[PDB]
Amino acid sequence: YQQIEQNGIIRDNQIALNEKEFDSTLASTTGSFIAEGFKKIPDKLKSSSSRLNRVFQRRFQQDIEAQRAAIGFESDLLSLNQLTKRKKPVTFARSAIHNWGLYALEPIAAKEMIIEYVGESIRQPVAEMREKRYIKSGIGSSYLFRIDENTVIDATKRGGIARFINHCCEPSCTAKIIKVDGRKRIVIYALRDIGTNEELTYDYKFEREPCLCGAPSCKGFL
């Protein structure tokens, strides 16, 4: 005990000195992890320029066009899109408004295209099988868009990052239907100055018959 006493004289007073380890809101942390219960809990405790690009993609038609002369055939040298020489930095992460959102990593200004919506091209019938099959297996995320009312664009399996845009009935982005070279494309412009690492928003316009946005002046449902 006298051995433990000389460890105790160190270990009593300095635990009121070394333990300045209080940073949190201090929730119910009295239980130990030794029984290893699951505790399914929905408790959320986390947080909640373009010059070079345009010259970069200018070098790609300064290279690819020299030796495409007879053939010719698409093979991925077919301009290797349009509507890509303007895309943006934008990334995806854990969203404040849902699982996954899209964020402007650059202070994009008022009316400036971010990203075209990419995916499959499927008609209205085959959409309705897919709209029910995914929900029949319970995906529970509607990744279909509308170009002209007898064809949709699917983004569940294939597609570009542009699916990851969430909803907010107080919008910041909208998606006009601009055609390039004789098919429609779904390009997604902006409405306001979007900050750096700000969340990108949208109206989905589900016409006609639950908004987890947590913003006040918005219809609670969709």
Binding site: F145, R146, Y204, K205, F206
Partner: peptide, 8 residues
């Protein structure tokens, strides 16, 4: 219904 859309 749940298909996203522009202008309707």
């Amino acid at each position: 219904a749940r298909t996203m859309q522009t202008a309707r």
